[PDB]
Design a protein around this ligand. Structure first.
Ligand code: NA
Lengths: 325, 325
């Protein structure tokens, strides 16, 4: 349905993102200290943007919109040179309320002209239009558009959009394999693991499982899971480890989970056999862009698990396309 | 069960914490920029300490040990004037490894003389001894000891330990009520909600459920839950909303969950009826100390759910008392 069609539009989304970046790159200059605000999937995207900002020498902080609204004093926001508001629809009430209280320069990230773009000074309107209640390629597209702008603003060379777009096409080749995983192992719960830039991807992947499949899904920074959290993983659990360059600890972690009876899917940019049950190797890209090919993989996994449960990921129970108050 | 005995020692834990604080207050000066490192429950305590540091005018940042070890570049650590390593046992390999890579002053927080105290410049050794694999009153005791030191260090008046200890005695009076909730409503999953300082408490509460009851538990900043996450809440779900001063949005959120069929337990410092099925009112304290009485409530809830499932919270399956590599 719509969710699947939209996941498959990821390659074109990258191209659309590159186009928007080039249109606004000389009109907007991203500063050193940046605050990122978003809700749900957009909060996880905010965390990813904050992380890559720090990775490139800046200082980025991300907070859920409502936490900024009602409990900002408990967060290390400090002086902000730019506030970035993220909303797929550009109509999320909380982001609009948050921006009303902000006096510094404001940059919006959304898929269309909206209430959001009207209260921001500049905006990245990436037309990765989605009919599904669940965000898929818009997340990936928003990330690339901003990443290009960030590298540019920081004096780094632009990434090759064509190469990255082709990388996501490679991700999509795994569709049948992912479908087979869902068919051959009827897991009852799942855990996503990632470190650094892949941690927010793990968080997003888990949310995709919740929304699309109404499923018991969790996400943790790779090795944090050993500290108590692993207690809920057994023979009915699928553990998804996402890692660019694994080392000995990763092999031990995989073995640890298998010893509890869980099956493990490793998604990486490495040919190494860590003892996993399922393996997905993705094209290795510039460190900052490397997480991109992982998104369509976890989105497809969530989609097919949803279908296997007879659910409609396009319109999950209890969820609204836009969260308003 | 050692776990229950230890939860009930919370009041005395506060007293022991105050004693440690007064012994070291003039031997340790806490700076402005502090990094908090911990694993599992100690990571959630680190988040709580980072938040209260920000609340009092300082700059606190918390990170899981492994993320600091392998992906520090993606975090806004910046300049660090003090590194606080938290470990109940003082033997967690990751904390030892993390502190060894740090050259600035180091403060350890633990229950006993250990590898940790031996590699720190000084430590807060709070004797809230626990034999259960699951951390309970030590979390609360560690928090109070450090909070006193922070207030003192920042020129604020000391909190009244006797008053705070008594407040936790009040929490314990809810044991029967909590037990009866567990015996009457056989929930299959649970969601903890909290904002500001209560968010880390929600994370810790969820971990207690995972470890003690091998249960499906989730935690989110109060209003973030509406953004997709709420999809997994229905008639088999118990939603635990923790809030000091509720307002209109809280009533709407409670009703929203009840409309999905879920039952709601509100733990607050307010007598306001938000439409909850179960209610637990706690003594309101200084803003920074206010979260303390909430801990024994969620620990008792997790303990009784574990017992109702024939599980042993003292020694959960798969878990080691101390995580090593
Ligand atoms: Na520990």
């Amino acid at each position: 349905m719509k969710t699947l069609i939209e996941i498959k539009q990821t390659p074109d989304g990258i191209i659309k993102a590159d186009k928007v970046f080039n249109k606004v790159k000389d009109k907007i200059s991203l500063p050193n200290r940046i605050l990122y605000l978003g809700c749900g999937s957009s909060h996880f995207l905010s965390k990813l943007l904050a992380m890559v900002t720090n990775m490139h020498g800046g200082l980025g902080i991300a907070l859920p919109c409502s936490e900024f609204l009602y409990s900002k004093e408990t967060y290390p926001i400090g002086e902000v040179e730019l506030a970035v508001g993220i909303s797929r629809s550009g109509e999320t009430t909380e982001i609009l309320l948050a921006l009303e209280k902000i006096n510094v320069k404001k940059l919006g990230i959304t898929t269309r002209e909206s209430s959001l773009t009207r209260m921001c000074d500049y905006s990245l309107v990436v037309p990765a239009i989605e009919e599904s209640v669940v965000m898929t390629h818009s997340f990936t597209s928003f990330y690339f558009a901003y990443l290009q702008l960030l590298r540019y603003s920081y004096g780094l060379p632009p990434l090759n959009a064509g190469e990255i777009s082709k990388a996501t096409e490679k991700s999509l080749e795994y569709e049948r394999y992912i479908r087979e995983i869902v068919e051959s192992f009827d897991f009852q719960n799942i855990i996503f693991l990632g470190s650094g830039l892949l941690y927010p991807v793990a968080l997003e992947a888990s949310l995709k499982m919740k929304e699309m499949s109404i499923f018991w899904s969790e996400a943790y920074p790779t090795f944090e899971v050993r500290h108590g959290f692993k207690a809920i993983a057994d023979e009915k659990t699928l553990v998804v480890l996402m890692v660019e360059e694994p080392f000995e600890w990763h092999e031990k972690l995989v073995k640890e989970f298998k010893n509890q009876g869980a099956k493990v899917l490793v998604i990486s940019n490495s040919p190494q056999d860590l003892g996993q049950d399922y393996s997905i190797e993705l094209p290795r890209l510039s460190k900052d862009a490397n997480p991109i090919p992982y998104l369509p993989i976890v989105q497809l996994l969530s989609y097919y698990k949803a279908v296997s449960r007879g659910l409609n990921p396009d319109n999950p129970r209890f969820l609204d396309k836009v969260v308003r108050w």
